[PDB]
Design a binder for this molecule. Structure first.
Ligand SMILES: *[C@@H]1O[C@H](CO)[C@@H](O[C@@H]2O[C@H](CO)[C@@H](O)[C@H](O)[C@H]2NC(C)=O)[C@H](O)[C@H]1NC(C)=O
Ligand SMILES: *[C@@H]1O[C@H](CO)[C@@H](O[C@@H]2O[C@H](CO)[C@@H](O)[C@H](O)[C@H]2NC(C)=O)[C@H](O)[C@H]1NC(C)=O
Ligand SMILES: *[C@@H]1O[C@H](CO)[C@@H](O[C@@H]2O[C@H](CO)[C@@H](O)[C@H](O)[C@H]2NC(C)=O)[C@H](O)[C@H]1NC(C)=O
Ligand SMILES: *[C@@H]1O[C@H](CO)[C@@H](O[C@@H]2O[C@H](CO)[C@@H](O)[C@H](O)[C@H]2NC(C)=O)[C@H](O)[C@H]1NC(C)=O
Ligand SMILES: *[C@@H]1O[C@H](CO)[C@@H](O[C@@H]2O[C@H](CO)[C@@H](O)[C@H](O)[C@H]2NC(C)=O)[C@H](O)[C@H]1NC(C)=O
Ligand SMILES: *[C@@H]1O[C@H](CO)[C@@H](O[C@@H]2O[C@H](CO)[C@@H](O)[C@H](O)[C@H]2NC(C)=O)[C@H](O)[C@H]1NC(C)=O
Ligand SMILES: *[C@@H]1O[C@H](CO)[C@@H](O[C@@H]2O[C@H](CO)[C@@H](O)[C@H](O)[C@H]2NC(C)=O)[C@H](O)[C@H]1NC(C)=O
Ligand SMILES: *[C@@H]1O[C@H](CO)[C@@H](O[C@@H]2O[C@H](CO)[C@@H](O)[C@H](O)[C@H]2NC(C)=O)[C@H](O)[C@H]1NC(C)=O
Ligand SMILES: *[C@@H]1O[C@H](CO)[C@@H](O)[C@H](O)[C@H]1NC(C)=O
Ligand SMILES: *[C@@H]1O[C@H](CO)[C@@H](O)[C@H](O)[C@H]1NC(C)=O
Ligand SMILES: *[C@@H]1O[C@H](CO)[C@@H](O)[C@H](O)[C@H]1NC(C)=O
Ligand SMILES: *[C@@H]1O[C@H](CO)[C@@H](O)[C@H](O)[C@H]1NC(C)=O
Ligand SMILES: *[C@@H]1O[C@H](CO)[C@@H](O)[C@H](O)[C@H]1NC(C)=O
Lengths: 121, 415, 187
């Protein structure tokens, strides 16, 4: 939330974005796909020289279908593909103990805890 | 009863997709700016490190919900300059290249109808707001791509490559899937086009006359603000101490006596922070469930035609178009509805030469003197021939069979 | 791990070991010290329980979604788009994983495509002809009818179409011939 001004360890390659002042990352003008998020449409990744690249996300290639009013496209061949999906079903079952955790093996601590109501049942 | 006329309708649906991302900072919130307060806080082991690790976990999901809902195209499609869609008119929702923030007209109305220093008040206490990853321009581009896909590729583009096809034949295919044969459409092209255009025109007027449906999208924002305000106001309570000013206590009492007041204040503020974070965690689940539902609707109603009833509008579904709204999405469902019904007398089967004839399609009807067979969802009489029925047994077991004569067209031809 | 490590905090007491307190003080002045430790540990336990309760609902929702996917994509064929993998769906296979399930969706995807010119209907003898199933295509010199998702040209016949009304009412009709297969066999 600083604007580039006030710095404490600055070198060069200072860049300003909408998410703050970025120091140490080189800025380019060729878009790519997002690898490590930064924000406000700015993404950074470690591509080639050996520096950190910061750029704007690219949504993908652009094409315009050759639309008409008497033109159609029909396939002539097909393909079979196989895809995988992963879904969780459960996690680890656990259980704790009232006295063993809060009071340990003490005997006075249990009597003192009985002052409280049913806070562990 | 058989319908004889049909009406095209347009319905709207509003769904929230995400909420604002906030973050806290205990040491500048609970303790403000002091040294003794931090030393006292050090006794409580790892509370705030956990709280800050949970709030970022909440925040990271808001940048994934929008990606799961909108980013469902691997390309970016562009509408052609040709605008001959058989009579239809998508000028109200197609992007308009006349303003720097390229958006459609209805999107502009949606943005203007939702109204959002508070940030400085948070900066007093270390609270901060983080911007979303996807800017609104990107969302507008995604919506334009999705809308341009269905115009010029039907529903094939969502399951492989994009294949162009004239709009009229696509609409004919879509009617073919709801039980009406194609020949209806081409005999009512202008009548359907005018109805669709008028239906589209009604929506902007409805949204320009202070619509009360957008409040659902508004309400959530209000709630967040309310809760946040409460948090700041919590700082103005003494919690049973002498005063709520941190420096005042240190400036009027000995440290060994001021430590107990400091402890009381710390306990109170920590409890308030816990309650606020728990509220945020509770609300995040509801927002995420709504986002998943919106993603399902987007994948089914838009990229195809869904035969599920009352899942993509009220009636027989034809298609849908998406629109982006501040922190939410708006669906426009196009629907087909029968209009004017007429009475008829029916009969299950016909037997003519000792064998019962069942209709291969549609239903038998009769106006009182002659018998016809017609498709179920529209009145269109045809003469009963052997290309419309099939034989099964002899007429002794059907409950309500009736005499009549079957044409059998081959015999006149051979004559 | 965080919950178990919380046990070391002093919580504003003399020491975090309870035996140290009850080996150095007489109980009337020891109860007040023990109270703070009890309060802090109880609060930590409450926080952990609340977090687990919150996460359980999300996991149960995911489990219900997995159950629906198993019931629909596997025990049958589902026509819902993008509910059993990208493209058209054919079948599914389940696999087990530690605390989870893995789905293998088999999908059919059209590969290539070609350009063609098409017309909505055909006028032959003043009557419009419509395709019973498929679409009309023409490579610039002849006219065929083919199925939607594959290329398989066939000759237009009265056994492959149906008539309705008269032409000049359709927006883009074109004129051609129809075979009528019965006629040659009649002679
Ligand atoms: C971020 O810092 C730059 C650097 O100063 C600001 O640019 C200044 O803006 C003020 C008011 O707009 C001008 O009076 C100065 O002359 C500008 N200086 C320079 C070097 O440009 C910029 O405005 C700051 N960001 C914001 C949002 O205010
Ligand atoms: C349809 O596609 C398949 C696969 O893309 C083609 O099969 C290949 O044909 C080439 C001949 O040029 C062979 O060398 C390959 O080995 C075949 N692939 C496999 C997996 O066996 C098929 O030829 C295509 N059909 C048409 C009509 O083009
Ligand atoms: C089906 O309904 C449409 C309108 O919903 C009818 O079209 C109207 O016809 C009247 C003639 O009496 C005209 O005055 C209107 O202007 C028409 N409406 C529109 C929007 O153009 C149509 O006639 C009905 N069909 C039948 C068979 O009754
Ligand atoms: C499609 O709809 C647009 C929107 O109404 C039509 O554009 C209007 O045209 C009239 C005159 O024809 C003007 O008075 C309006 O100001 C126009 N509105 C807008 C928003 O531009 C358009 O004529 C319709 N038809 C076509 C083929 O585009
Ligand atoms: C029921 O429909 C039949 C079929 O159109 C009607 O019969 C026609 O009636 C008109 C007017 O009387 C005649 O010009 C036609 O020659 C008749 N055709 C046949 C095949 O009979 C009949 O009139 C209708 N009945 C009622 C009560 O409306
Ligand atoms: C179909 O028509 C016949 C009439 O030819 C109806 O019933 C027959 O009637 C004749 C004399 O009228 C009897 O000799 C036959 O025995 C009758 N048939 C039977 C099966 O009993 C017959 O009911 C008509 N079908 C209907 C009205 O559904
Ligand atoms: C369009 O396809 C048809 C179908 O094959 C072609 O017509 C055949 O062409 C071959 C030689 O090119 C002839 O031997 C056949 O007799 C033709 N069949 C008929 C029914 O006429 C036609 O040539 C193709 N046209 C183009 C421009 O490729
Ligand atoms: C398709 O061909 C038929 C002829 O079989 C055309 O019908 C005649 O077209 C001419 C000129 O287009 C008219 O002058 C006649 O009145 C039409 N009817 C006849 C001769 O009975 C038909 O117009 C053609 N359709 C087209 C070119 O779209
Ligand atoms: C990136 O910005 C620099 C600075 O003006 C400009 O010279 C350069 O042309 C830009 N990159 C491209 C690819 O245009
Ligand atoms: C059909 O007949 C019933 C009884 O005569 C009548 O109540 C009903 O209105 C008729 N249907 C229509 C569409 O008029
Ligand atoms: C239909 O009902 C009428 C009386 O309501 C009865 O006379 C007739 O037999 C019934 N027909 C059938 C097929 O149920
Ligand atoms: C079909 O024709 C159009 C006409 O310009 C062309 O742009 C398009 O690339 C063609 N399709 C293929 C697959 O070659
Ligand atoms: C298709 O568009 C062309 C313009 O390129 C026009 O000449 C033709 O009449 C149109 N056909 C239909 C059926 O609209």
């Amino acid at each position: 939330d600083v604007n580039c001004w006030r710095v404490y360890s600055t070198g060069s390659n200072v860049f300003q974005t909408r998410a703050g002042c970025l120091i140490g990352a080189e800025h380019v003008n060729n878009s790519y796909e997002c690898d490590i998020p930064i924000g406000a449409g700015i993404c950074a990744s470690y591509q080639t020289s050996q520096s950190i690249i910061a750029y704007t996300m690219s949504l993908g290639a652009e094409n315009s279908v050759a639309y008409s009013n008497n033109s159609i496209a029909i396939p002539t061949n097909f393909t079979i593909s196989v895809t995988t999906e992963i879904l969780p079903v459960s996690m680890t079952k656990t259980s704790v103990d009232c006295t063993m955790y809060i009071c340990g093996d003490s005997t006075e601590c249990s009597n003192l805890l009985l002052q409280y109501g049913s806070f562990c049942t | 009863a058989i319908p004889t006329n049909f009406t095209i309708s347009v319905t709207t649906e509003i769904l929230p997709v995400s909420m604002t991302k906030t973050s806290v900072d205990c040491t500048m919130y609970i303790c403000g700016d002091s040294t003794e307060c931090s030393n006292l806080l050090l006794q409580y082991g790892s509370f705030c490190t956990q709280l800050n690790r949970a709030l970022t976990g909440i925040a990271v999901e808001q940048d994934k919900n929008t990606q799961e809902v909108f980013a469902q195209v691997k390309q970016i499609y562009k509408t052609p300059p040709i605008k001959d869609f058989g009579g239809f008119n998508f000028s109200q929702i197609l992007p308009d290249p006349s303003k720097p923030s390229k958006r459609s007209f209805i999107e502009d109305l949606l943005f203007n109808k939702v109204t959002l220093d508070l940030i400085c008040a948070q900066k007093f206490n270390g609270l901060t707001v983080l911007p979303p990853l996807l800017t609104d321009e990107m969302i507008a581009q995604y919506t334009s791509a999705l809308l341009a896909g269905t115009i010029t590729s039907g529903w094939t583009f969502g399951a492989g490559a994009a294949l162009q096809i004239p709009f009229a034949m696509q609409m004919a295919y879509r009617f073919n899937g709801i039980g009406v044969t194609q020949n209806v459409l081409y005999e009512n092209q202008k009548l359907i086009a005018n109805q669709f255009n008028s239906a589209i025109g009604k929506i902007q007027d409805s949204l320009s006359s202070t619509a009360s449906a957008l409040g659902k999208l508004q309400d959530v924002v209000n709630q967040n603000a309310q809760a946040l305000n409460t948090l700041v106001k919590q700082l103005s309570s003494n919690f049973g101490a002498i005063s709520s000013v941190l420096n005042d206590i240190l400036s009027r009492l000995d440290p060994p006596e001021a430590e107990v007041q400091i402890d009381r204040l710390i306990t109170g503020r920590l409890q308030s922070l816990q309650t606020y974070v728990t509220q945020q965690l509770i609300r995040a689940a509801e927002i995420r469930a709504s986002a998943n539902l919106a993603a399902t609707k987007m994948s089914e109603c838009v990229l195809g035609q869904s035969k599920r009833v009352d899942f993509c509008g009220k009636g027989y579904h034809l298609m849908s178009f998406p629109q982006s709204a501040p922190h939410g999405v708006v669906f426009l469902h196009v629907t087909y509805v029968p209009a004017q019904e007429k009475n008829f007398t029916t009969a299950p089967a016909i037997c003519h030469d000792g064998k019962a004839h069942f209709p291969r399609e549609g239903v038998f009807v009769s106006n009182g003197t002659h018998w016809f067979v017609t498709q179920r969802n529209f009145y269109e009489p045809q003469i009963i021939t052997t290309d419309n029925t099939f034989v099964s047994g002899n007429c002794d077991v059907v409950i309500g069979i009736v005499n009549n004569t079957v044409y059998d067209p081959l015999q006149p031809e051979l004559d």
